[PDB]
A paper describes a structure:
Indeed, URH1p was initially classified as a nucleoside hydrolase (NH) with a pronounced preference for uridine substrate but was later shown to also participate in a Preiss-Handler-dependent pathway for recycling of both endogenous and exogenous nicotinamide riboside (NR) towards NAD+ synthesis. We show that the URH1p has similar catalytic efficiencies for hydrolysis of NR and uridine, advocating a dual role of the enzyme in both NAD+ synthesis and nucleobase salvage. The crystal structure of URH1p showed that the enzyme belongs to the group I structural homology group of the Ca2+-dependent NHs and displays a monomeric structure that is unprecedented in this class of enzymes. The yeast URH1p, a cytosolic enzyme, was found to exhibit uridine and NR hydrolase activity, contributing both to the cell’s ability to recover uracil for nucleotide biosynthesis and maintain a balanced pool of nucleotides for DNA, RNA and cofactor synthesis and to regulate NAD+ concentration through the Preiss-Handler shunt.
The asymmetric unit of the hexagonal crystals contains two URH1p monomers, covalently linked by a disulphide bridge involving residue Cys142 from both chains. Making only marginal non-covalent interactions between the two protein monomers in the asymmetric unit, it is thus evident that the URH1p dimer found in the crystal is principally caused by an adventitious disulphide bridge between Cys142 residues, not representing a physiologically relevant quaternary arrangement. The URH1p structure retains the characteristic open (α, β) NH fold that is composed of an eight-stranded central mixed β-sheet (β1-β7 and β10) surrounded by the connecting α-helices, a helical domain that completes the active site, and two additional antiparallel β-strands (β8 and β9) extending away from the core sheet. The crystal structure of URH1p closely resembles the “closed” conformation observed for the ligand-bound NHs, with an ordered loop that connects strand β3 to helices α3.1 and α3.2 (the so-called “β3-α3 loop”) and a defined conformation of the α8 helix with only its short C-terminal portion (amino acids 242 to 246) flexible, as judged by the weak electron density. Since ligand-free group I NHs typically display high flexibility in the β3-α3 loop and α8 helix, we infer that the contacts with the Tris molecule found in the active site stabilise the observed closed conformation. Indeed, the side chain imidazole ring of His86, a crucial residue in modulating NH activity and structural dynamics, is within hydrogen bonding distance from one hydroxyl of the Tris molecule, and this interaction is likely pivotal for the closed conformation of the β3-α3 loop. Further contacts are observed between the Tris molecule and amino acid residues Asn42, Thr130, Asn165, Glu173, Asn175 and Asp255, whose homologues are involved in substrate binding in other NHs.
Residue numbers in the entry: 4 to 241, 247 to 340
Amino acid sequence: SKIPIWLDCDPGHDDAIAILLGCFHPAFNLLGISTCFGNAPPENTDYNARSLLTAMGKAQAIPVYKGAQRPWKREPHYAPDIHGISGLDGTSLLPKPTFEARTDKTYIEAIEEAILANNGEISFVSTGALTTLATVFRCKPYLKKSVKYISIMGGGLHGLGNCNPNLSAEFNVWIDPDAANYIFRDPDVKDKCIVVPLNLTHKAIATYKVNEMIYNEKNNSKLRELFLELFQFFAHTYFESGPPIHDPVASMPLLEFYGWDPSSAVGFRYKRMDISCIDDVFNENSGKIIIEKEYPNDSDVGTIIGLDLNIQYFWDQIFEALNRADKMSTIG
Ligand SMILES: [Ca+2]
């Protein structure tokens, strides 16, 4: 009756909105969160996640584990330019977290539980690196055939990117190309992977119209203010229309595929392709996506590559979630 999910993220301004959806959208049973390295160091992305949940009141519902703390191979390089030093700069409203990251078990064990608990029905959602999920599947490969979908925000098609000398690579793939390949090339997994690339996410712009919706004379919670202050800082690091909010877009295909709403509503269109990426770090196009193969639209084989969705609908979902979050705000 409700889409069970695990979220691996690196908050992260756009990742904060991913958490908001998974916590508060009526369609999602969030089973837990794993934080990886990426936008900031792993200690920051951990704290940032637990701070958000504490602000939204969800710090005693949503289990938090520390995920992958570093890439498989490459030296960790973070993004201070876009996200700041804490990885979530621009808002002082973020409260000191009530709860610790849980240590009853490894994150691999926690994800193992969650998958088996929702055997065949769960979807894993990576808004950060693919290191967390690639490690789970290395260590516990039996778990592959239990996950229904893996919804990834990452990659860019046709040499679209925000990383590497040529801007040919997208961040989440670039920070661990090995982990990405291990996912994209595995025949068990690649066929049920959903990829939401820069091509698609760059449609998810937070314009003046969107900011009005988050904060206005009718609706001016401090929680609402927090989320506004994120959108603003994200925009300051840019698209004159405003900044794209990449990570929540990975939730939309699930709403269509699990059939929360009709495809007419969600409007999620996609292709079927095998993909890989350049994982030689010394390569100038390090991380750039290669399209290995392409398939007819009725194909079962191939990674599911997002092309278009209804951006109106996207935003309606975020606002829906935000009105419920507002009721559970712990910071005024
Ligand atoms: Ca992210």
